[model samples]
Target: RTCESQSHKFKGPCASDHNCASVCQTERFSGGRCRGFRRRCFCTTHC
Candidate 1:
């Protein structure tokens, strides 16, 4: 999957809040949170 941010550029597998930051350049619970999750521990970066 690919994640695109209106303000930044990067994408990768999301394993945690830090992974989200590394790819999306934002925290999972930031001003704009990551948009998709499956189990309680799994998340997907939004595109």
Candidate 2:
């Protein structure tokens, strides 16, 4: 399984996984995607 963490560097509305994951990589997470009703960037990693 994996865990999702809210990204600190990702600002503004998260519209694309590419941008989200790119920023999330800087934070040391595996990847990221847009999530939630507000469409925020959420990073993913093995828990």
Candidate 3:
């Protein structure tokens, strides 16, 4: 299986995972997580 990500490029600093998941959901992602040092929103899904 292969996995790929869809990025939402966080506009502002993220404080909560719930907030991240909200945006990711708009993009049809299974879930959202804050990642990297910059704390960006990464939408996850199976590809």
Candidate of highest lDDT = 2
lDDT (Cα, tens digit) per residue for candidate 1, span 1-47: 45434413324433454554554434442222344542122334444
Question: Residues 4-45, candidate 2, lDDT per residue (tens digit)?
Answer: 778767778886788878877876857888775348878889
TM-score of each: 0.24, 0.70, 0.56
Residue 33 of model 2, lDDT score: 82
Higher lDDT: candidate 2 or 3? Answer: 2
Q: Report the error of model 2 at residue 4, Å.
A: 1.1
TM value for model 3: 0.56
Off by over 4 Å in 2: 36-38
Instruction: Say which prediction, candidate 1 or candidate 2, comes out ahead on TM-score.
Output: 2
Q: In model 1, which runs have C-alpha deviations exceeding 4 angstroms?
A: 1-14, 26-47
Candidate 1 positional error at 2, Å: 24
Selected candidate, larger TM-score, 1 vs 3: 3
Q: Quick one: ranking by TM-score, best first? A: 2, 3, 1
Q: Residue 14 of model 1: what lDDT? A: 36
